[PDB]
Amino acid sequence: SPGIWQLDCTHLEGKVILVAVHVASGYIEAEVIPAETGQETAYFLLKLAGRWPVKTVHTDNGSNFTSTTVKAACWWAGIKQEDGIPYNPQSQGVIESMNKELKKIIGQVRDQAEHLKTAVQMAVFIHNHKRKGYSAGERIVDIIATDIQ
Amino acid sequence: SPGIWQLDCTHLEGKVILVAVHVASGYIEAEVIPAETGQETAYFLLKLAGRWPVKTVHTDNGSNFTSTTVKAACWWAGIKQEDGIPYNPQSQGVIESMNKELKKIIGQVRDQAEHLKTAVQMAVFIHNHKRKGYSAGERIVDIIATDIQT
Ligand SMILES: CC[C@H](C)NC(=O)c1ccccc1CN(C)Cc1ccc2c(c1C(=O)O)OC[C@H](CCC(=O)O)O2
Ligand SMILES: CC[C@H](C)NC(=O)c1ccccc1CN(C)Cc1ccc2c(c1C(=O)O)OC[C@H](CCC(=O)O)O2
Ligand SMILES: [Cl-]
Ligand SMILES: [Cl-]
């Protein structure tokens, strides 16, 4: 499971925050986009896969699963595109709790930037560095390193 | 040196490609921007530091070094902003060759996307995954993991 990621789309301020979660570590990357389209999702995945060894992505909905733009990007980047059906029901709850936590952090920083995109990157930073004791940023690196070796 | 990064700005197609290189591994992140400004650089560093444990950034030029916008982002993210003076002359050459390699890869993929930004992300992917043997992506993770066990 070092290579498995989950996509997650949440809304704030009339915009969309697209999140990718590294399932085993809870590490995240995120971006603000005007709306979820296949093209936005495809580009986001392309970025993610150039930065981390992304083997599998559990897509966030059926439209992204279906999208030929998303499929083409997964093909290009060597990603196995899978559904995100919560066969383990605890997955829904974990995602919902992460979205709530992220929005809480965005609120706490919202004053330290004019633009939502900046606040979201601040939120990513705080989420990934938070010791819960190791941080998510530490866990993902350790997981992948162990896999390499 | 697990935490040291170097900024690098190169130009293509009338646009600017801002690159951050993890010095010890050669791993990179990059984005296309219309022009280098303090604000663009500040935002790029904010992104980078939320994703990797960035201790020190050797800035690419004196304007970004001076920039109060860049300084504010570095303060926020806990980054030590340093100059990028190549006291070791090997550094100019390493960056130049990287820019040349990246532009080559962009040309090789240029036909697989309408937009330069897409091609640049494809170039990042190819650069980071290229086995030279380990890839830069493998080296950065090994370097940081080794550091964390300290
Ligand atoms: C960042 C941490 C510091 C402590 N906060 C402040 O100094 C601060 C605090 C409150 C209000 C304004 C500011 C000043 N601003 C300039 C912060 C900023 C930097 C880069 C950006 C921004 C923003 C933004 O205000 O959101 O917005 C997106 C933009 C995208 C790239 C591009 O378009 O160039 O990059
Ligand atoms: C990508 C790999 C595949 C094999 N290549 C093609 O299928 C392909 C090949 C040639 C020409 C057009 C295409 C089709 N396009 C749609 C590729 C694409 C996807 C997401 C993007 C793009 C682009 C783009 O063409 O550059 O541009 C930036 C945009 C930014 C996010 C936003 O604005 O939504 O995200
Ligand atoms: Cl981190
Ligand atoms: Cl990689």
From TrEMBL, chain B:
One of its GO terms (cellular component) is viral nucleocapsid. Its cofactor is Mg(2+). It catalyses: 3'-end directed exonucleolytic cleavage of viral RNA-DNA hybrid; Endohydrolysis of RNA in RNA/DNA hybrids. Three different cleavage modes: 1. sequence-specific internal cleavage of RNA. Human immunodeficiency virus type 1 and Moloney murine leukemia virus enzymes prefer to cleave the RNA strand one nucleotide away from the RNA-DNA junction. 2. RNA 5'-end directed cleavage 13-19 nucleotides from the RNA end. 3. DNA 3'-end directed cleavage 15-20 nucleotides away from the primer terminus. It is a lipid-anchor. It is found in: Host cell membrane; Host cytoplasm; Host nucleus; Virion. Residues 1-144 form the Integrase catalytic domain. GO terms for biological process: DNA integration; DNA recombination; establishment of integrated proviral latency; proteolysis; symbiont entry into host cell; symbiont-mediated suppression of host gene expression; viral genome integration into host DNA; viral penetration into host nucleus. Signal peptide: none annotated. The keyword S-adenosyl-L-methionine does not apply. GO terms for molecular function: aspartic-type endopeptidase activity; DNA binding; DNA-directed DNA polymerase activity; endonuclease activity; exoribonuclease H activity; lipid binding; RNA stem-loop binding; RNA-directed DNA polymerase activity. Keywords: Aspartyl protease, Capsid protein, DNA integration, DNA recombination, DNA-binding, DNA-directed DNA polymerase, Endonuclease, Eukaryotic host gene expression shutoff by virus, Eukaryotic host translation shutoff by virus, Host cell membrane, Host cytoplasm, Host gene expression shutoff by virus, Host membrane, Host nucleus, Host-virus interaction, Hydrolase, Lipid-binding, Lipoprotein, Magnesium, Membrane, Metal-binding, Multifunctional enzyme, Myristate, Nuclease, Nucleotidyltransferase, Phosphoprotein, Protease, Repeat, RNA-binding, RNA-directed DNA polymerase, Transferase, Viral genome integration, Viral nucleoprotein, Viral penetration into host nucleus, Viral release from host cell, Virion, Virion maturation, Virus entry into host cell, Zinc, Zinc-finger. Its main location: host cell. This is Gag-Pol polyprotein. The lineage of its organism: Viruses, Riboviria, Pararnavirae, Artverviricota, Revtraviricetes. The chain holds residues 57 to 210 of 288 of the full protein.
